[PDB]
Design a protein around this ligand. Structure first.
Ligand SMILES: *[C@@H]1O[C@H](CO)[C@@H](O[C@@H]2O[C@H](CO)[C@@H](O[C@@H]3O[C@H](CO)[C@@H](O)[C@H](O)[C@@H]3O)[C@H](O)[C@H]2NC(C)=O)[C@H](O)[C@H]1NC(C)=O
Lengths: 228, 214, 165, 110, 125, 111
């Protein structure tokens, strides 16, 4: 099985440094050039760098040129990317990839081939670990349609990702919808989870959203009830 | 160019053929070959085409590449549901300091259901937040297809743009789409205006919901 | 040879996690009342319903030539080929800096020898110090298990005698 | 591509066959994954097919090229056919024969 | 042209004996083990026996074990089944079939291959 | 067992996928590969699948074999009316005196 596995990703403050590694198995690593390519969340692919089989040749994207250094150790079947002077815009999933062709041709050049690892995420911000505030989004006359009612929870101001949300301690699964997070200009994340239920239910049932934020080891449960 | 030029999006019906163009210059595509890659959500890119026209093992023969001058094109025949993905072109470039250039990517949609306007639910600020000296209006947008909308917030009738954060549309479990929009205000602003509204435009049709303090 | 070191080039229990290593015996190589096989080679076969492409290399760090031997199995029918190795289209490739060869299965009805209508061909090479040998296969490979690092010497040869040493 | 030997003597013809290290590079160079080279005269006949194997790089190349030759008699024709991998003849040599020569190795001055 | 043709089938009284034959063509008979398999009308398939290419190894189903003996003549490309001490429940259509694989592997064993004859009916009553 | 365990019958509508199980023991399926045969009324059995997952020339790829533990399964995708037949599995068995075991058969009906 041909495989690349990246590691070393994480959250870091700008101007600081981080080193990524990529372990290869199942093909002759020492026979291939290797690329680093990155992709910002919700964005396109950006080539980062290439290194020759023997480490004798290295090329960098201009956006990182002079800041990052690529290297490899063929005896450990590992590729490295040293990232210095980090900026917020370096936030991305970083992939390593085996070069398209084993031999170099000066009329063909370099490019990423069929084998990519699953990627490792690097996040550069000023934000610091913070558990969420949780507020109930109450059902009211303004949130009710014919037969059905909407209710939810607002999960505000956390960092870093992720948070998890369940409803009624796992008893409520049908109708649960957890929305993807926004990344606010503040550096904190927010999301909303909404449950659609028949208006009939509104009365007896109580509704508690269970939010877990592991990075700050914070959990908040908040009950959402009809207004009175 | 630092980035090869691709159309932002493309679409087709099942069974149809679709092409995606990729334009460069003498120092890249005019000199070196083009690769094509396919990326499905949450997964690494897949190599599709190399040396302009060739397919790695596993890639069906309905994928073919071609070029003319400094432009190249990827053709996909007999479009299948599983083809919805972002497609990237790439080439070596011997300008400046030699480098690989990727295209910006093309999202290919195989339309997979009848068009559906969004349901919109707008929640006002909670008493806890107002007493915390904050005010958030929460606009939840769901069950729409295609997966693209724009959101405009209004105070009375005037557009409020400051304090707005909106998520990128996301595929739901049911293959319709969801998005959310947050309007941040101070409590004093909240109390001063007569009403606020969240207006969502989808495929030329608008759905609007309104709350007021009451 | 003035000395050699036999050594386990590709240890049986760890070199081939994705292929079957325990089913590689036959009655043509029977020993002590039971089917067996060469001690210095390892007959890899498909694991479950799949034989994935293997790739395995050895760097000669012995400070001398290493003699590497291997084999290629040639089943009698496409059915037995398929049954053993899964891949109808299998090949074996072996290369070093100086050695280079591609092998493709030979399927032929032919008579039985020691009960087997199949055949195995045997191959060898001398891997120079510091050089690397690489095996790639999608079937039919009789893998190296043990190899021999050799020290060379001249002007000898082989005789046949029943006289006691 | 064919050559008729109108030189009035043997012509030494050399050519080569390239062996990329992977099928991907083969395909990338010659387009045809399944390529061959055939060379024939009235007396010579040989088929060469790329033998693709992962192997270490020598002089920066994991690929290999094998080199071949034949002697085309006066009046005879040599024909090259290929769907990839041919390192074609460019120059060849018309030869004059003599018995009893050979090669020595010496650093002494001529 | 590949072919197996069974013959020798028929009606016989219980406790008596009968010999069946199977003629092979279109493949190298002497290179393959051969099986006998039987099927009672409206009932399932039941394997009977196998004999190796050279006759040196033979295996029988328990239901006929000790009663039937399988053999072959490679020079005539013919397989035989000698059935002794017949019972009513041995009544069946009898098929011969070429073994799956030409070479024997002891982790794979024996099994009926792609070639079966049309069958011959044997009735014991 | 002297005889492998199969469901007596199975059915499906055209275009559907259907699976047929075959249960044995450590000494057969747990040790040796499984063959599958298809038998139409009044005709000799035809070999369908061998070495668990493999098809002889002529057998479409919508026929597939698999196994788990001491059980094996034949899957038929895109069911066709003409596929209606009785299906038998078989395996070598090294218990007692070694022998081939057939299953009791599964009659497949296309609705
Ligand atoms: C090691 O060497 C010995 C001696 O050669 C091998 O034993 C012998 O093997 C041969 C070939 O199988 C036997 O000859 C045969 O005899 C049978 C009759 O039973 C005949 O039908 C065959 O055509 C062939 O002529 C021989 O009987 C047997 N016995 C002896 C002399 O030892 C042995 O097979 C070798 N072991 C291995 C695993 O290399």
């Amino acid at each position: 099985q041909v495989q690349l596995v990246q590691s070393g990703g994480g959250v870091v403050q700008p101007r600081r440094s981080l080193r990524l590694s990529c372990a290869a198995s199942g093909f002759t690593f020492s026979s291939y050039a290797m690329h680093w390519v990155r992709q910002a969340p919700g964005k396109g692919l950006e080539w980062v760098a290439v290194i020759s089989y023997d480490g004798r040749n290295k090329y960098y994207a201009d956006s990182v040129k002079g800041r990052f250094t690529v290297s490899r150790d063929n005896s450990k079947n590992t590729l490295y990317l040293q990232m210095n002077s980090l900026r917020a815009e370096d936030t991305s999933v970083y992939y390593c990839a085996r070069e398209l062709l084993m031999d170099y041709y000066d009329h063909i050049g370099y490019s990423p081939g069929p084998t990519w690892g699953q990627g490792t995420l690097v996040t550069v911000s000023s934000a610091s670990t913070k558990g969420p505030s949780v507020f109930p989004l109450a059902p009211s006359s303004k949130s009710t349609s014919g037969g059905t009612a909407a209710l939810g929870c607002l999960v505000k101001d956390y960092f870093p990702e992720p948070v998890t949300v369940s409803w009624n301690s796992g008893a409520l699964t049908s109708g649960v919808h957890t929305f993807p997070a926004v990344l606010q200009s503040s550096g904190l994340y927010s999301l909303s989870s909404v449950v659609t239920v028949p208006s009939s239910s509104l009365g007896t049932q109580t509704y508690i959203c269970n939010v877990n934020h592991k990075p700050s080891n914070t959990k908040v449960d908040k009950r959402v009830e009809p207004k009175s | 160019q630092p980035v090869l030029t691709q159309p932002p999006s493309a679409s087709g019906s099942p069974g149809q053929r679709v092409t995606i163009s990729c334009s460069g210059s003498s120092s890249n595509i005019g000199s070196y070959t083009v690769n094509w890659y396919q990326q499905l959500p949450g997964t690494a890119p897949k190599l599709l085409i190399y040396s302009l026209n060739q397919r790695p093992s596993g890639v069906p023969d309905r994928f073919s590449g071609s070029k003319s001058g400094t432009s190249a094109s990827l053709a996909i025949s007999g479009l299948q549901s599983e083809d919805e993905a972002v497609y990237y072109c790439a080439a070596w470039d011997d300008s400046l300091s030699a480098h690989v250039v990727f295209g910006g990517g093309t999202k290919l949609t195989v339309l997979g259901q009848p068009k559906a306007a969004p349901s919109v639910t707008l929640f006002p600020p909670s008493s806890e937040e107002l007493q915390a000296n904050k005010a958030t209006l929460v606009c939840l947008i769901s069950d729409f297809y295609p997966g693209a909308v724009t959101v405009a917030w209004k105070a009375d009738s005037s557009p409020v743009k400051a304090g707005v954060e909106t998520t990128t549309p996301s595929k739901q479990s049911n293959n319709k789409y969801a998005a959310s929009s947050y309007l941040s205000l101070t409590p004093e602003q909240w109390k001063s205006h007569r009403s606020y509204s969240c207006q969502v435009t989808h495929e030329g049709s608008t759905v609007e919901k309104t709350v007021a303090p009451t | 040879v003035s000395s050699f070191e036999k050594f386990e080039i590709f240890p049986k229990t760890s070199s081939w996690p994705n292929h079957e290593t325990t089913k590689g015996v036959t009655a043509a190589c029977s020993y002590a009342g039971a089917s067996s096989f060469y001690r210095n080679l390892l007959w890899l076969t498909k694991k479950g319903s799949s034989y994935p492409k293997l790739s395995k290399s050895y760097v000669n760090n012995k400070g001398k030539e290493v003699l590497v031997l291997w084999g290629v199995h040639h089943p009698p029918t496409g059915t037995d080929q398929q049954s053993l190795y899964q891949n109808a289209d299998a090949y074996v490739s072996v290369g070093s800096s100086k050695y280079n060869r591609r092998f493709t299965p030979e399927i032929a009805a032919r008579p039985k020898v020691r009960d087997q209508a199949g055949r195995m061909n045997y191959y060898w090479t001398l891997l120079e110090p510091g050089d690397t040998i690489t095996f790639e296969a999608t079937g039919n490979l009789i893998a190296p298990w043990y190899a021999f690092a050799l020290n060379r010497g001249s002007g000898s040869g082989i005789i046949t005698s029943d006289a006691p040493v």
